[PDB]
Write an enzyme that holds these catalytic residues in place. Structure first.
Site, PDB file in Angstrom:
ATOM      1  N   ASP A 349       0.856  -1.176   0.000  1.00  0.00           N
ATOM      2  CA  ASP A 349       0.000   0.000   0.000  1.00  0.00           C
ATOM      3  C   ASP A 349       0.895   1.228   0.000  1.00  0.00           C
ATOM      4  OD1 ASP A 349      -2.052   1.938   0.263  1.00  0.00           O
ATOM      5  OD2 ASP A 349      -2.712   1.194   2.202  1.00  0.00           O
ATOM      6  N   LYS A 460      -9.074  34.530  -2.219  1.00  0.00           N
ATOM      7  CA  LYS A 460      -8.165  33.769  -1.375  1.00  0.00           C
ATOM      8  C   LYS A 460      -6.729  34.260  -1.534  1.00  0.00           C
ATOM      9  CE  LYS A 460      -5.793  30.610  -2.970  1.00  0.00           C
ATOM     10  NZ  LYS A 460      -4.549  31.095  -2.330  1.00  0.00           N
ATOM     11  N   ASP A 690      -1.200  -0.410   5.698  1.00  0.00           N
ATOM     12  CA  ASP A 690      -1.194   0.530   6.816  1.00  0.00           C
ATOM     13  C   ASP A 690      -2.560   0.746   7.452  1.00  0.00           C
ATOM     14  OD1 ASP A 690      -2.217   2.273   4.654  1.00  0.00           O
ATOM     15  OD2 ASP A 690      -1.849   3.914   6.059  1.00  0.00           O
ATOM     16  N   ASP A 694      -6.701  -1.972   4.098  1.00  0.00           N
ATOM     17  CA  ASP A 694      -5.859  -3.123   3.799  1.00  0.00           C
ATOM     18  C   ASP A 694      -6.210  -4.336   4.651  1.00  0.00           C
ATOM     19  OD1 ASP A 694      -4.394  -1.057   2.316  1.00  0.00           O
ATOM     20  OD2 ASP A 694      -3.383  -0.638   4.216  1.00  0.00           O
TER      21      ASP A 694
HETATM   22  F1  BEF Z   1      -2.788   4.033  -0.022  1.00  0.00           F
HETATM   23 BE1  BEF Z   1      -3.096   2.819   0.582  1.00  0.00          BE
HETATM   24  F2  BEF Z   1      -4.198   2.224  -0.027  1.00  0.00           F
HETATM   25  F3  BEF Z   1      -3.456   3.100   1.891  1.00  0.00           F
HETATM   26 MG   LIG Z   2      -1.908   2.953   2.903  1.00  0.00          MG
END
Ligand code: BEF
Ligand SMILES: [Mg+2]
Ligand SMILES: CCCCCCCCCC(=O)OC[C@H]1O[C@H](O[C@]2(CO)O[C@H](CO)[C@@H](O)[C@@H]2O)[C@H](O)[C@@H](O)[C@@H]1O
Ligand SMILES: *[C@@]1(O)O[C@H](CO)[C@@H](O[C@@]2(O)O[C@H](CO)[C@@H](O)[C@H](O)[C@H]2NC(C)=O)[C@H](O)[C@H]1NC(C)=O
Ligand SMILES: CC(C)CCC[C@@H](C)[C@H]1CC[C@H]2[C@@H]3CC=C4C[C@@H](O)CC[C@]4(C)[C@H]3CC[C@]12C
Ligand SMILES: *[C@@]1(O)O[C@H](CO)[C@@H](O)[C@H](O)[C@H]1NC(C)=O
Ligand SMILES: *[C@@]1(O)O[C@H](CO)[C@@H](O)[C@H](O)[C@H]1NC(C)=O
Ligand SMILES: [Mg+2]
Ligand SMILES: [Mg+2]
EC number: 7.2.2.13
Lengths: 996, 291
Positions: A349, A460, A690, A694
């Site tokens: 990830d 802005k 993480d 996942d």
């Molecule tokens: F970017 Be990963 F899916 F957390």
């Molecule tokens: Mg991730």
């Protein structure tokens, strides 16, 4: 009907978001801004239950015990134990005053498993034990406003259809819809892997429920800004809880290691039945009684079963894991340690796993040149040159323009790993100064502000104006930070090397050119301009305006651009390359935006530089995307939206015909489908994650992994491996060990197995030729479970024969743990030599006391009788029952010794599969020690007082020790030349058979 | 899964015929080489041991004390009337003694009459094949007194009050020694001491002693002893069919139809015993003559 429940969980999320403000009310009947009545709340709390995820069913500790007491290898041993008693029972009735040998075997067999089991459970407990030590999480009070009385309540107490103020720094209570907003942004990284905080808006944005800003998610928190909103889904109904429930209710899959055991088990019994059946045939052909024949079959099959190997394997497995735990690589399940080596394909990830989930200063542009700031977590990166004064004129703007500062509590905590309030972008800027340009705390107060400008939705821009303490030019100074396009309008001069310069158009192109390049990189781009405010034309003291615009907006002095992105971890790039070196497939799965992802894989080695995505080819030719054939693109990008409309078959195609491959905008469910698609190839796949997105994959993965602190707790539990240090490089170490332990097991397995051929052999000829029994059953135990173990364990410590990392992934349908080849080498040849020596020793002793080999045939019958006491030898002396029995016992003992002597060579030869003894050398200290342990033990076993009384094992005359020395030396000679013969011959028949 | 036998390649049981042969040749050659080695090692071992003597005699230092009617449990139970009941016990007594009549003891060189009186042990040279085939001392069946007495005593034996005889295990070169002159441990039933090896039997326990009324032992010299002259046995091969000395005992006013236990104890300096080998120079027996 849960398969449907699982299937519904597998489906992509569906929700209703777009509707009139009034309509949300027309569904849940709650006043838009008045909150609700208590009576309404009470009804719902019964209706749906409290706002919490259902705890995963607790598993009682006692249950686990049985698991290792059963398993697979343990089960094989049991039947043996049982088959001892079943044999013993038959034996008990038929025989008169029967020998208690068979009964003893069974109790020991069961005990070994029970011990092994007890030992195993001790470790698997210790993990989840210490795993609970970092599971010290905390409830967070919910922020609630009811009936306009602003009454905060407990998070569990939360109910549907209620109002909530998501102030900055408060965790989102539950999935809710938004009615009002003041720029609150939320970290959706855990749920959907959005590295950048995404702002929250009441209005609808995108069809995908996850993407639209109107809705909110659990296990997220409002970082900056504030907003309010009304409940939708709570407790189990929450998307994350559904996701977790999904994960926990999945199949952990068969781990590759234990499967090789299950094939290993087949071969063991497979030869055993053939040997036993053949012997049973021969036994009947030999005229012995049917009842006795059965006993014979059982005995051969039983003794054929490995005894201590189970303990050796378990201990060896644990040791390897310990070193991992020494380096903060923990495994909840002992078996999974080997999985890393077996992996042919990986899926990691982006955020939190590769990324640090922190916005961070990436690149800087000063004096018309670029300077990539060191992106390193640990500050190991190289640094830009700070000599130019433009760095100073730049750094000050960031240090002062930023709104907040570090929390007071942080002290010796490293600069990078310390929490800060407000926008992360501001934080990274505060950081970059704090490392590179001294401190900020003093620097912030040393230049005293007067008036600041907060973020404004209309027009802005963000600016402030402070005083100049440096005595050179007391005139006050104004600093503005803003988006580049807006900033471009308000600046004319540019400072290069401390000299103001006007807006030449060519420089304007360069700033625009730089802006474009950074945007492709994906780092958020911020521009900084500061112009001295003079004191002659404007009073040095009090002359300010806040409503009507006084100070010069335009014609300021620009300084440079600073870029922010979430970098990878320090060791991530090198590790990826190392994995690729083993031929392992590297693939990135995230739910993040493609823009950010593509660059990451380019920078970390997933995408080799110069390989083209289907799209790059289009861009290289300014042509429609459709034309180019996909084969030309070695790599391919796949947006999540397309994935939904995709068929399992297409994936298969997408996988094989590509290598570098990345998906994005992917749902967690969609992740799981990827893993199965990888699995459908029949290959071994691993997963690193993480956040909660996942959680499903790690579980259904052959083995899942996560980060010890930067990870989500739900996923943490599902994974089979936890990285405490969050050192991604540990995965590289893991594969090294996994391949390493694999081979050493092959080595270990052989040593204990070869022992069985001489173990069993006497028992066989004893029946066939009716000779005195050359080897006691008790003595076998001293080999299988006494002397041999300490070497068998030592074997595991063997170092690497060669650079295993170079080796490609093995194939599970090809190079199996225990092939037919291994049996041939040990059972077929070495074992026969191993046994032959014992018989030689056996013959020598009997002769040396006048019992001639030729004369020993058929002697069993009269031998074992307890009453005949005038037994004659070839020399013709007469012997009493006990004496000739003492001789047999004292003849059993050398057999035990010779076995050790013969096993000595095996310990050495099985230390290497290919290299010569000294090519690898006897560097394994534990191996060496065992040699002495084994020897000393054996010696003691024969010479302690009364061993011939307690264990029926008598002392040994000195000549006997050197009896089998030629045999053992010969064994050494055969194997060495054989391993050295396959060194020279790369592909010779020698390899196909002898090599194991 | 049962496709291993044949395929397109037609590997037999998953192995090609050519390989099948190659393994066979190597295996056969290897097995042949292995066998040849082992045998050659054994051939050496043969040459270590001289035919005439054994290299280690430590485990026969306390010699054995076998009976003649070896029984499944040293127990004799039978009908003093039924031949079948006592047939098994008696059957061996003859086939044992078969090689003891004056018929076998015919060749003058092979058999030398030691004498009718116990004498000094007949040392016969130093063991070697350099000296010729040495001589055996004769043993007459008649030395048994009215036990296996033929003309004098019935072949019955087990009709009533059966005889039982004890044989010392033959041990190469064993030189029996007379019991110590000091007689503290010597129950002196027999007056003769110098050239006779004392043999005595007694009941297992005090109650057993009461049960057995009397026992009579008949032997050469009218003494319950082995002939010192006969020993030392010099080789079964060296003295083919050397005849072991035989000593016998008989019982009188016994208690029939009642199991009783008898212990026969050899005596002399060079005799040991073990609480783990009942036959180790000691002797036990269970006997029951049920009518
Ligand atoms: F970017 Be990963 F899916 F957390
Ligand atoms: Mg991730
Ligand atoms: C005889 C049975 C063993 C033979 C043997 O093991 O000797 C080689 C030994 O030599 C060793 O050192 C190395 C191994 O790195 O061996 C070579 C020595 O000339 C050289 O290649 C290198 O210095 C260590 O003593 C031992 O562990 C190693 O067994
Ligand atoms: C021998 O075994 O048996 C005969 C009997 O068969 C015994 O000679 C009676 O039996 O014994 C007394 C003397 O003990 C004589 O007065 C009788 O005449 C004997 N009768 C017969 C028919 O002979 C003899 O005692 C015995 N010998 C031994 C050594 O026990
Ligand atoms: C050529 C070298 C390497 C070895 C050849 C093996 C042969 C020739 C030798 C080597 C070791 C020897 C054996 C080692 C030990 C014993 C036990 C002893 O009580 C009698 C001799 C005996 C039985 C030896 C027999 C001969 C033997 C088997
Ligand atoms: C014996 O020792 O003692 C007897 C005295 O009771 C004696 O008559 C006999 O001759 C002795 N014999 C020997 C050999 O000492
Ligand atoms: C016999 O031994 O014991 C009898 C007692 O049971 C006794 O009357 C008889 O005299 C004994 N006979 C002999 C020969 O001693
Ligand atoms: Mg798992
Ligand atoms: Mg074994």
């Amino acid at each position: 009907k849960e398969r449907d429940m699982d299937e519904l969980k597998k489906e992509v999320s569906m929700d209703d978001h777009k509707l009139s403000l009034d309509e949300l009310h027309r569904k849940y009947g709650t006043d838009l801004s008045r909150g609700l009545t208590p009576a309404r709340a009470a009804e719902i709390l019964a209706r749906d239950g409290p706002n919490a995820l259902t705890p995963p069913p607790t598993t009682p500790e006692w249950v686990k015990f049985c698991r290792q007491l059963f398993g697979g290898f343990s089960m094989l041993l049991w039947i043996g134990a049982i088959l001892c008693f079943l044999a013993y029972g038959i034996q008990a009735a038929t025989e008169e005053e029967p020998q208690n040998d068979n009964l003893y075997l069974g109790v020991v067999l069961s005990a070994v498993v029970i011990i092994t089991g007890c030992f195993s459970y001790y470790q698997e407990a210790k993990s989840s034990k210490i795993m609970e030590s970092f599971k010290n999480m905390v409830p967070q009070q919910a922020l609630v406003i009811r009936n306009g009385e602003k009454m905060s309540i407990n998070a569990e107490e939360v109910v549907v259809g209620d109002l909530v103020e998501v102030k900055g720094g408060d965790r989102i209570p539950a999935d809710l819809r938004i009615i009002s907003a003041n720029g609150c942004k939320v970290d959706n990284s855990s749920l959907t892997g959005e590295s950048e905080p995404q702002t929250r808006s009441p209005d609808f944005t995108n069809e995908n429920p996850l993407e639209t800003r109107n809705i909110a998610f659990f296990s997220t928190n409002c970082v900056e800004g504030t907003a309010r909103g009304i409940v939708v889904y709570t407790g189990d109904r929450t998307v994350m809880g559904r996701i977790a429930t999904l994960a926990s209710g999945l199949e952990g899959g068969q781990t590759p290691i234990a499967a090789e055991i299950e094939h290993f088990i087949h071969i063991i019994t497979g030869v055993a039945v053939f040997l036993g059946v053949s012997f049973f045939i021969l036994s009947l052909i030999l005229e012995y009684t049917w009842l006795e024949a059965v006993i014979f079959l059982i005995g051969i099959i039983v003794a054929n079963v490995p005894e201590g190997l189970l303990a050796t394997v378990t201990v060896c497995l644990t040791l390897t894991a310990k070193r991992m735990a020494r380096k903060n690589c923990l495994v909840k399940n002992l078996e999974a340690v080997e999985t890393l080596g077996s992996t042919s394909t990986i899926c990691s990830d982006k955020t939190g796993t590769l990324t640090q989930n922190r916005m961070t200063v990436a690149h800087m542009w000063s004096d018309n040149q670029i300077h990539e700031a060191d992106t390193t977590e640990n500050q190991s990166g190289v640094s830009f040159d700070k000599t130019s004064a433009t760095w100073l004129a730049l750094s000050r703007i960031a240090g002062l323009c930023n709104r907040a500062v570090f929390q007071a509590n942080q002290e010796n905590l490293p600069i990078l790993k310390r929490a800060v309030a407000g926008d992360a972008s501001e934080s990274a800027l505060l950081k970059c100064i704090e490392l590179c340009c001294g401190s900020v705390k003093e620097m912030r107060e040393r230049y005293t502000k007067i008036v600041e400008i907060p973020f404004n939705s209309t027009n802005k821009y963000q600016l402030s104006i402070h005083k100049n303490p440096n005595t050179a030019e007391p005139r006050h100074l104004l600093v503005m930070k803003g988006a580049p396009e807006r900033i471009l309008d308000r600046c004319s001069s540019i400072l290069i090397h401390g000299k103001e310069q006007p807006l030449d158009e060519e420089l304007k192109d360069a700033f625009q050119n730089a802006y474009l390049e950074l945007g492709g990189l994906g780092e958020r781009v911020l521009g900084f301009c500061h112009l001295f405010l003079p004191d002659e034309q404007f009073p040095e003291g009090f002359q300010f305006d806040t409503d009507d615009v006084n100070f010069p907006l335009d014609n300021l002095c620009f300084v440079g651009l600073i870029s922010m992105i979430d970098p990878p971890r320090a060791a991530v790039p090198d590790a990826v390359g190392k994995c690729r070196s083993a031929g392992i497939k590297v693939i990135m799965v995230t739910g993040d935006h493609p823009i950010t992802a593509k660059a990451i894989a380019k920078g970390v080695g997933i995408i080799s530089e110069g390989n083209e995505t289907v799209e790059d080819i289009a861009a290289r030719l300014n042509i429609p995307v459709s034309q180019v054939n996909p084969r030309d693109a070695k790599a391919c990008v796949v947006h999540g939206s397309d994935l939904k409309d995709m068929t399992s078959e297409q994936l298969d195609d997408i996988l094989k015909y590509h290598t570098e491959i990345v998906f994005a905008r992917t749902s967690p469910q969609q992740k799981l489908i990827i893993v199965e698609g990888c699995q459908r190839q029949g290959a071994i796949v691993a997963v690193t994650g993480d956040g909660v997105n996942d959680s499903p994959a790690s579980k259904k993965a052959d083995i899942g992994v996560a980060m010890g602190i930067a990870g989500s707790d739900v996923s943490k539990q599902a994974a089979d491996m936890i990285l405490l240090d969050d050192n991604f490089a540990s995965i590289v170490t893991g594969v090294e060990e996994g391949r390493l332990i694999f081979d050493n097991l092959k080595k270990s397995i052989a040593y204990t197995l070869t022992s069985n051929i001489p173990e069993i052999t006497p028992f066989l000829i004893f029946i066939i030729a009716n000779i005195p029994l050359p080897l006691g059953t008790v003595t076998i135990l001293c080999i299988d479970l006494g002397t041999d173990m300490v070497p068998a364990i030592s074997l595991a410590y063997e170092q690497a024969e060669s650079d295993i990392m170079k080796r490609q992934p093995r194939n599970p349908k090809t190079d199996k743990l225990v092939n037919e080849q291994l049996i041939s080498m040990a059972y077929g040849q070495i074992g026969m030599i191993q046994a032959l020596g014992g018989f030689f020793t056996y013959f020598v002793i009997l002769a040396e006391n006048g019992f001639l080999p030729i004369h020993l045939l058929g002697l069993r019958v009269n031998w074992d009788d307890r009453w005949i006491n005038d037994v004659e030898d070839s020399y013709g002396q007469q012997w009493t029952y006990e004496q000739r029995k003492i001789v047999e016992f004292t003849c059993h003992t050398p057999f035990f010794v010779t076995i050790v002597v013969v096993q000595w060579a095996d310990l050495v030869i099985c230390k290497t599969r290919r290299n010569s003894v000294f090519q690898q050398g006897m560097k394994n200290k534990i191996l060496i020690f065992g040699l002495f342990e084994e020897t000393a033990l054996a010696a003691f076993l024969s010479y302690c007082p009364g061993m011939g009384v307690a264990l029926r094992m008598y002392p040994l005359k000195p000549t006997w020790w050197f009896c089998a020395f030629p045999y053992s030396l010969l064994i050494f000679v055969y194997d060495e030349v054989r391993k050295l013969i396959i060194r020279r011959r790369p592909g010779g028949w020698v390899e196909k058979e002898t090599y194991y | 899964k049962k496709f291993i036998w044949n395929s397109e390649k037609k590997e037999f049981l998953g192995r090609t015929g050519g390989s099948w042969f190659k393994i066979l040749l190597f295996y056969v050659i290897f097995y042949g080489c292995l066998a040849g080695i082992f045998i050659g090692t054994i051939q050496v071992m043969l040459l270590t041991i001289s035919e005439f003597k054994p290299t280690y005699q430590d485990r026969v230092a306390p010699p054995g004390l076998t009976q003649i009617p070896q029984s499944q449990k040293t127990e004799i139970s039978f009908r003093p009337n039924d031949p079948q009941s006592y047939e098994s016990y008696v059957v061996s007594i003859v086939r044992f003694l078969e090689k003891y009549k004056d018929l076998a003891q015919k060749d003058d060189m092979i058999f030398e009459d030691c004498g009718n009186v116990p004498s000094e042990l007949k040392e016969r040279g130093e063991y070697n094949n350099e000296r010729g085939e040495r001589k055996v001392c004769r043993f007459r069946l008649e030395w048994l007194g009215n036990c296996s007495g033929l003309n004098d005593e019935t072949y019955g034996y087990k009709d009533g009050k059966p005889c039982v005889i004890i044989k010392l295990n033959r041990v190469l070169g064993f030189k029996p020694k007379p019991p110590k002159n000091e007689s503290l441990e010597t129950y002196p039933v027999m007056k003769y001491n110098p050239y006779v090896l004392p043999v005595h039997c007694t009941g297992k326990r005090d109650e057993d002693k009461e049960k057995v009324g009397t026992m009579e032992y008949f032997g050469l010299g009218g003494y319950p002893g082995f002939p010192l002259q006969y020993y030392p046995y010099y080789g079964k091969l060296l003295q083919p069919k050397y005849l072991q000395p035989l000593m016998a005992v008989q019982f009188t006013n016994l208690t029939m139809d009642t199991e009783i236990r008898i212990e026969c104890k050899a005596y002399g300096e060079n005799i040991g015993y073990s609480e783990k080998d009942r036959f180790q120079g000691r002797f036990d027996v269970k006997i029951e003559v049920k009518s």
